[PDB]
Subunit: 394 residues, 5 copies
């Protein structure tokens, strides 16, 4: 009875085109906020953030009021899209192909005329995703909301703090906060300033996954390249080991290239460490070629330089703690015996060149091991969030 009577009366002469103020010269205060249920997807490559959000819009509708004693039991009424005036608040920085992704629900109105409009939606929004420190990165994705076609003279947009009471944690992203800011900007279209309310979703990436799936595997696989320095030259597999490990590491940059936007704004930290590793492994192959030249050095070819004999076999080697008819028969056997002496003399020259190769391996083992260690630590610890990350995620 009363519900039926109220609805009929409330729509009488109601025009949803009309901004529901008793005084047209005054603006309409609209309180705006949102509830952040969950961060669904942070697309780095396309620079889009996906969130499950419940917008929260409240205002007073001067015409939607009644005395509850004349309609007992009817404390609230509901109105669907198009039958009541509502604010045209949109996400400016939407990435959604239909632009407005909100699911229109009922506006809930109480007898004093206070309206509650809480449309849910899956929102896609453009977010400059800074990849400089990936995987130890923190993002600040803006969500700018404002009335599209009412400026500050007609619609006084006001902010209320975001609700995260129902926030469900992501797994990849720790929510740091969703602070909000209400600004009043002018646009080149119009002479009226249009207020907006922007919420900044601050997110720390949780680093365990990429620590285990990219960083640590690259460390361990690249160190396998350093075993080339311990592998004997006579194995005939130094180059196969080195070049095979090097080209396998390309998978990691391919994986990174599948996550990262193709931008020139910064060079991601992960890329810097992967580039350093492949350069170090590539130089290990370069050094390996030198070691093989020494190992295989032709004994009749050019003699070992004095510098080589001292810088490698003396100094570096010490530091590393390495260190009638009888006459004819006589001349024939002399030849055979002297022939062996030359062979053995050439053997000793070869041995020194092979010893030089071993010493070069040993110095390069220590040098590439130490150089691998410092470049890795230095690159990873240059991230401001590294210490926080290691403490929180590991």
């Amino acid at each position: 009875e009363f519900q039926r009577k109220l609805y009929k009366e409330l729509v009488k002469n109601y025009n949803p085109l009309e901004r529901p103020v008793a005084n047209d010269s005054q603006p309409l205060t609209v309180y705006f906020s949102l509830s952040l249920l969950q961060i669904m997807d942070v697309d780095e490559k396309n620079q889009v953030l996906t969130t499950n959000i419940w917008l929260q819009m409240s205002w007073t509708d001067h015409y939607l009021q009644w005395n509850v004693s004349e309609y007992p039991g009817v404390k609230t009424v509901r109105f669907p899209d198009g039958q009541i005036w509502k604010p045209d608040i949109l996400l400016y920085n939407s990435a959604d192909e239909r632009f407005d992704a909100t699911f229109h629900t009922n506006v809930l109105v109480n007898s004093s005329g206070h309206c509650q409009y809480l449309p849910p939606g899956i929102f896609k929004s453009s977010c400059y995703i800074d990849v400089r420190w990936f995987p130890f990165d923190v993002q600040h994705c803006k969500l700018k909301f404002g009335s599209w076609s009412y400026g500050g003279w007609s619609l006084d947009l006001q902010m209320q703090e975001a609700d995260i009471s129902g926030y469900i944690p992501n797994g990849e992203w720790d929510l740091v906060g969703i602070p909000g800011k209400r600004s009043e900007r002018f646009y080149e279209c119009c002479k009226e300033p249009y207020p907006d309310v922007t919420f900044t979703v601050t997110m720390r990436r949780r680093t365990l996954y990429y620590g285990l799936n990219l960083l640590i595997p690259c460390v361990l696989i690249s160190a396998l390249a350093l075993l080339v320095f311990l592998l004997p030259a006579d194995s005939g597999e130094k180059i196969s080991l080195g070049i095979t490990v090097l080209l396998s590491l390309t998978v990691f940059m391919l994986l990174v290239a599948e996550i990262m936007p193709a931008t020139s704004d910064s060079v991601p930290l992960i890329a810097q460490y992967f580039a350093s590793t492949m350069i170090i492994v590539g130089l290990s192959v370069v050094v390996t070629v030198i070691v093989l030249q020494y190992h295989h050095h032709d004994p009749d070819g050019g003699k070992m330089p004095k510098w080589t004999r001292v810088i490698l076999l003396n100094w570096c080697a010490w530091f590393l703690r390495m260190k009638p008819d009888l006459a004819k028969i006589l001349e024939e056997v002399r030849y055979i015996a002297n022939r062996f002496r030359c062979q053995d003399e050439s053997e000793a020259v070869c041995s020194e060149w092979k010893f030089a190769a071993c010493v070069v391996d040993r110095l390069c083992l220590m040098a590439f091991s130490v150089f691998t260690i410092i470049c890795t630590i230095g690159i990873l610890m240059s991230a401001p969030n590294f210490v926080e990350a290691v403490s929180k995620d590991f």
Copy 2:
């Protein structure tokens, strides 16, 4: 005649905005349930569950009633979307881009005014998919349903057990059950509690596919790395075999990385076993390098330590059950003969170093075989659902 007359009468003064209760002060009981036809897709990476569901909503509409003796043969009437009041029940944790994925169908109303609304739909819902025990994992995906804009004072949502009579099994997922729970929660928007009905779809993954396509192939491919310990050093292919098998195993983690969400909440069991295998294969390469140093040990280089001569050639080897002018001609032939004696003396030193290499291979074969076996069993059997899985799926 009568159908035409009834429809005309039933819409007379009917307002679909009105909650159809004879007494406005009382809430409207709405019975909610669903029928689960099939689980279409469990997207682990995006944490979304896709289901084919028929929602089941029933309530009484006080105004949609008639006396069947005055409209003979008209036992039921149907009303499409927008012409009758219906509950605004939505899936809260929807992942769908249009949020509400239900296909609006007719509400079926009988002469007593009992309404049946059974909209089908393909529903996408956010589901925390726990990957800790993958592939031996069990998921519990919630489907939370509630009236969006009517709270408990106006709409008394009540639960009925889910219907699985038409459930078509998936192939990848065994349905354990779809129990339901009706809660009464308060929200930071409002002072009215909003009832909800949540159904939890419990699903056991069937493990045969990933058992055959990931786990078993990795076991068999990694064991091929253990053949390096049986391969003779003189083959000159120990490193090629080991490093080639190791880098091939990366395909499996790449496959896993194509299924798993990039989260830091847990480390999947499959990842733990794959990580253990590659570490074991990687260490086999490391050991292989040592075996080659022994095999190729320079005989003039450092003598074999007493520890090496005993720990390998004595103890471990036993356990493994291995074990004028004539004077000038004389001095020339003496040199040639003594030269051979030194060569043979150096040969025996080489042989001992090569024997040491063989013993190290043999110990490492037994050690890496046993270590491969226990790590594999221990990791796989740490899954609570392993014994159930093996019994049910294999």
Copy 3:
């Protein structure tokens, strides 16, 4: 004149909510069928069939009738969606995200009131796609159609044979038939049985493509592994050939894993043959390691067992059709000459071990060739549709 007059008269008091029967107590016969234009996509991984279909619905509308002599030249009238009653027939097992994929077109009505409604659409439907015999598989995808909200008491759904006169063949799938079946089932929602009409699209896969792109390439690539048995051990490339071929075959299972659903219902035949091939190639590597141990056997190491000397060098080898100062100088030259005799004695031992390696290669060549042949034939011919496929597709 007459068209304008008829349309006006026909809509007078017409209520599209009304089921158009002259007698409300009787059900309305609705003839249902479809025309199958083409099979667009059979998605095995997602278990969805995509078809281009023209539904065919016919019924009589008691109110949409006129005497053609009073409206000369107006033999038919058309009505778009929402202005005439039509059956609410839906595809139950739809996979489409909007569930109902039909494109609403006009209902064509003639002066006797017979209605023709032939909406086209691209339909997505859930189909249990049995992969047990892939690529020699035959599918039976059901398309279940029924009135969503009218049961058998109100709507007498009747079947007519599917039209394939306009069927355009697919290229991958031979259409076997689209038989139809009309059932009368009860549901747990309701006490009225709801009739349905299900058409079963039977499809034979054409096997040439996967025969040429998966099966035959795997046969030919795997046979290249058998050349290891003909490759001499001294080449030092036996392991590189075997392991390289083995790991290349993984591409094929990766390709298969990109087509197959991740289900545990069956193990596809293609997977069984690929698994057999890799196991055979993997065992060839295992045998290759043994052959290298024989080839490289240390002559001073353990003597050849009597079993080895007979089972390989005698029986299997036959079957394969293989088969003062002068005294000092004397003792010095004696040593040199006796030294050569021991070297030659050890050479003969080595030769026997190398001959044993060659015989093992030869037996394994014949054994792995024969074993490859039978496993391949046996697996492929275990498919019931193999003989049909080879005759029809090759």
Copy 4:
């Protein structure tokens, strides 16, 4: 004034359900054509063509006419969707998920009642894409248009030649023409023939891209396999070169398999040439194994057949232009000297076997080079459009 007056008058008693003919017994002539702006995507795998098209529909509306002297300045009026009758022309062979992809725009009507309806749209259409001659292929994609629910008795569909004045060339596809054909077919639904207008978009693929990205790279990479015949056996890298090149060529068929539909209707020319190349490279590996058996032939093993000594070392080799105490000391030195003579005798046998290996390499180099050349030319020149393609694209 006049625009406002005309619109009011024109809608008075207008029924958009009515086919706008002054005489209902006559059919309505509808002129149909289209403008082809651009070919957006030719999806070979899914057999769908995507085009940007402006449909062109014209007809006369008997009711939408006025005298321009009574409405001065109003020479035309526009009507949006649903307010005027228009033809229900659809694309029969649509691949679009919503089936009808046209963007409804205004119908432009002039004072004589001539209507112009030119809706744009992005159209997806099913096209049998014949892959037999890919990349030198020419396609003929049909676009069949017709009134869905008006047959020839009511709607006289007439064709006008397609407009390509605004055609923007594709880059991958040369447009040959878009001829049109008007047919009159009967359907199994109805007794009225339904006219249709089909346009056939003929397209020649431009071959430069696939010439440079698939064909030529495969030629050059496969020829690298032929260097195995020039590589000395003693390098110990013949098998690594051959098998490594062979397995790298699989990338190309993988790329092709990512473009081609999985159909059994034909075998693409590109596939035939790739299959020929891998078979030739695979046989080169097979021959390489034989060459290594000769190179490594055991000298004590079976003697070289007379056929081998003549067919290789004589004929083929010529064609290729290759070609007391002193007695004891005596017997001891005799042994040492005779021992060397046997070694040298065995050396000469080895040399002949190694020479045989070199000759086999040389014949196979010339044979595989010539065989590679003819198979490549013969396969590529079997395409009817090859000569056209090479002239136009290269």
Copy 5:
């Protein structure tokens, strides 16, 4: 009061079909522009540009005017889609599947009747993306806007300069400008010219990303192939190094093939440099085979040509700065000693052939290094935007 009164009066007799001019014979001036917020995605493969744009349409509506002194405080009114006439301006070269991607918002009208319509949208547009100079490319994507169904006689479309005040930079693309051009073209449909306003979005690609991820990695990986010339032949890994590096470089063209459209209009610069690199690396393998023939040259085989002895061992080598019973015993030892002399004579021949191999390596090292350098510089510097790019991006 006044807002309610104004809205009622303004809609009285208003017909949104009517073009709002006081004089129908005159055209309606519509000012068109846009605001470019951000370039979202430049899809090279599909030739589609995605932009976030706010269209700006302004015109005067003769009927939507009032005297503000009679409606105090009501300075503006808003009207949603379908209740007011607006221009039907569309993007002609749209790539969007629904063609018109604009999100319809309110038209803002002030008391003088000036209308502001600023619909936002995510626009997809076809853009010929010229890949000739990629990654150093500059694109000019047209955005053609015009009234679909009003020609110049009725609608006088006028341009205003694009607004980039809110432009957010992309990261991959530097915005050069968005100049606009208003044209007046005739179409084959009609006799009225249809004005249009086209904006050309000029974009320079920022090259750092592809410089670091494609160009530089290819340079550094390919140079590793040049180490084959420094690797000794006796290593037995020259071919493994060369062919392994060569086939790894295929990844880069695969990456490029994943970005580039499959067009034959041009050959991208990146492809030209990648093709040059692989040809150079491939020729290095070809040369490596020659070096191995020299290294392994049979000493008894054909003597070294005079040309070889001079062009390599003399000229090129200099430039590179390389450089009773006793009689029987006598004849036996003579044989042994003469046997060694022949061995040593053959050794010297071998050494010269090995020296020739070393010289060929050295010339080829210098030749391939220099040839790699010039081809790389020459190809990269042939891009007109190279110098700009290096200065701006590096």
